[PDB]
């Protein structure tokens, strides 16, 4: 009940993985305002050079329930379309979550991709991970994912 809580998800995309990996990982801070300008106000690198160790800050628009998030890149293997990164700060963590650790892995399937993401919610000591909260966060994450995919399909030159 006070353990970390992990979900794994796999889905195929018609988008080629080099584009999806830039949009969803490496340059996500530069795409999220373009793909979801009704949710995200800004995305920027606040520390680092783009690679391992980089911290990004994403802020939400006014009127959104959330305010900002900081993520750090832990591991990047761009040739294999793999990244581990950690959401380590922000109001979305509320009081009970220490960090959320993400692993993304894509591979080419014909002209598109197969993607796998693992998400691990780490509660603070003496706290628990609330499943309804995870469900709502994951629904919203899945909306972002699908709207990035719809943006890349509508704008085929981007990251091509
Ligand atoms: Cl600032």
- How many domains in the chain? 1
Torsion angle of C-alpha atoms 42, 92, 106, 122, degrees rounded to 10 = 150
Please give the method by which this entry was determined. X-ray
- Whole-number Å distance, alpha carbon 46 to ligand 1 midpoint, is 9
Mention every residue, 6+ apart, whose C-beta is less than 8 A from residue 118.
6, 7, 8, 102, 103
- Whole-number Å distance, alpha carbon 56 to ligand 1 midpoint, is 12
**What's the rounded Cα separation, in Å, for the pair 9 and 146?**
14
Q: Report the CATH number that the domain containing residue 87 is assigned in CATH.
A: 3.30.530.20
Question: Using an 8 Å Cβ cutoff, are 118 and 102 in contact?
Answer: yes
Q: Where are the alpha helices (DSSP H) in the chain?
A: 17-21, 28-35, 131-154
Task: Please identify which residue in the block is written with the tokens 């709207």.
Answer: 147
| Residue 36 per-residue DSSP state | -
**What's the rounded Cα separation, in Å, for the pair 11 and 74?**
23
- Whole-number Å distance, alpha carbon 59 to ligand 1 midpoint, is 10
Which residue range(s) make up the domain with 3?
Answer: 1-160
Nearest to 92 by CA among 37, 54, 118, 130: 130
- Whole-number Å distance, alpha carbon 67 to ligand 1 midpoint, is 12
- Whole-number Å distance, alpha carbon 135 to ligand 1 midpoint, is 30
Lookup: tokens for 113: 């991709």
Final resolution, Å = 1.7
- Whole-number Å distance, alpha carbon 25 to ligand 1 midpoint, is 22
Helix (H, G, I), strand (E, B), or coil: what is residue 45?
Answer: strand
For 50-85, letters b (16+ CB in 10 Å) and e give eeeebbbbbbbeeeeeeeebebbbeebeeeebbbbb
């Amino acid at each position: 009940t006070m353990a970390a809580y992990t979900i794994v998800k796999e889905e195929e995309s018609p988008i080629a993985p080099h584009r999806l990996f830039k949009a969803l990982v490496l340059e996500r801070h530069q795409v999220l305002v373009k793909a979801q300008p009704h949710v995200f106000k800004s995305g920027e690198i606040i520390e680092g050079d783009g690679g391992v160790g980089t911290v990004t800050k994403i802020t939400f628009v006014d009127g959104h329930p959330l305010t900002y998030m900081l993520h750090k890149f832990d591991e990047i293997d761009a040739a294999n379309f793999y990244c581990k990164y950690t959401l380590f700060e922000g109001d979305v963590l509320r009081d009970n979550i220490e960090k959320v650790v993400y692993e993304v892995k894509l591979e080419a399937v014909g002209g598109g991709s197969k993607g796998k993401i693992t998400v691990t919610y780490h509660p603070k000591p003496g706290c628990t991970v609330n499943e309804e909260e995870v469900k709502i966060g994951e629904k919203k994450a899945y909306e972002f994912y699908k709207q990035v995919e719809e943006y890349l399909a509508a704008n085929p030159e981007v990251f091509a």
